[PDB]
Amino acid sequence: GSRKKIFKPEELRQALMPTLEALYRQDPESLPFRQPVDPQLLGIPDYFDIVKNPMDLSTIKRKLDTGQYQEPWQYVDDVWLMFNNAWLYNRKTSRVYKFCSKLAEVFEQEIDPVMQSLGYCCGRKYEFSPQTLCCYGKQLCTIPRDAAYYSYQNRYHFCEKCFTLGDDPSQPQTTISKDQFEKKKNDTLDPEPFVDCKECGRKMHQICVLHYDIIWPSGFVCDNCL
Numbered sequence: 001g002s003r004k005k006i007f008k009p010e011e012l013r014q015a016l017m018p019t020l021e022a023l024y025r026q027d028p029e030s031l032p033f034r035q036p037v038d039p040q041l042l043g044i045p046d047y048f049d050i051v052k053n054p055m056d057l058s059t060i061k062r063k064l065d066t067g068q069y070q071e072p073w074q075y076v077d078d079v080w081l082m083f084n085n086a087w088l089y090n091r092k093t094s095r096v097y098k099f100c101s102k103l104a105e106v107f108e109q110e111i112d113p114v115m116q117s118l119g120y121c122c123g124r125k126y127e128f129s130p131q132t133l134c135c136y137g138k139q140l141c142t143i144p145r146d147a148a149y150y151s152y153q154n155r156y157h158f159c160e161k162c163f164t165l166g167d168d169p170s171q172p173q174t175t176i177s178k179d180q181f182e183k184k185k186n187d188t189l190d191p192e193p194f195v196d197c198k199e200c201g202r203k204m205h206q207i208c209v210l211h212y213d214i215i216w217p218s219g220f221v222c223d224n225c226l
């Protein structure tokens with residue numbers, strides 16, 4: 001930013017620690033998350049084959065306590081890294097998975113006013129809904145949220161009912177092997193994209209701060225920097 005906002009460690013600790021404490025308070029649901037994952041002790045020796053960057057409540061607290069975050073979205077990212085690790089490693093029917101989901105529900109209810117007190121639009125990391133996908137074999141056809149579909153290379157998509165590829169009428173089409181696709185479900189949420197305030201440098205969501213009737217020819221400036 002031009003007049004950059006610098007967060008001092010105590011500012012971040014005092015603002016964000018209540019949201020971490022809200023997770024700690026959940027009993028039984030925080031219990032799997034209060035300490036670093038110890039695969040030999042827990043009997044899950046394949047853990048680090050699947051989880052490459054572990055995260056837990058005690059580590060996040062230590063990072064807040066020692067000023068290891070420069071800005072609060074780094075804290076939000078660590079909280080969701082912790083959650084996403086657990087949703088990846090554990091089965092949907094498992095205790096740890098269900099406890100993770102409770103913690104995420106608590107976090108999402110706590111984080112917005114805290115991030116707003118630090119000058120941000122909100123604290124919400126992910127978009128509200130999966131994006132609607134375009135379906136290749138009809139013109140009209142689209143893949144709604146949570147629908148099943150097939151996909152090659154994350155790009156050419158087909159709804160399973162109508163399941164020779166090209167992305168432009170002038171592009172020579174190629175024959176791809178049906179049985180080289182991957183069946184998927186359209187239930188993934190992407191991170192909400194950001195725009196930086198050109199004065200203070202805070203990352204704000206495009207959807208929160210950019211409006212259909214406003215132009216920013218010299219660059220976005222947030223409400224507090226105006």
Ligand SMILES: C[C@@H]1CC(=O)Nc2cccc(-c3cccc(OCc4ccccc4)c3)c2N1
Pocket residue numbers: 028031032033037042044085086089090096
């Ligand atoms: C996050 C971490 C690692 C993980 O992804 N999966 C996992 C698998 C097996 C046990 C635990 C585990 C670790 C510590 C405590 C714990 O407690 C479970 C429990 C049992 C009974 C009451 C309350 C909590 C489970 C666990 N969790």
Ligand code: NA
Pocket residue numbers: 087088089090091092
């Ligand atoms: Na899983």
Ligand SMILES: [Zn+2]
Pocket residue numbers: 121122123124204205208
């Ligand atoms: Zn926002």
Ligand SMILES: [Zn+2]
Pocket residue numbers: 135136137138141142158159162
């Ligand atoms: Zn279709």
Ligand SMILES: [Zn+2]
Pocket residue numbers: 197198199200201202221222223224225
């Ligand atoms: Zn600003």
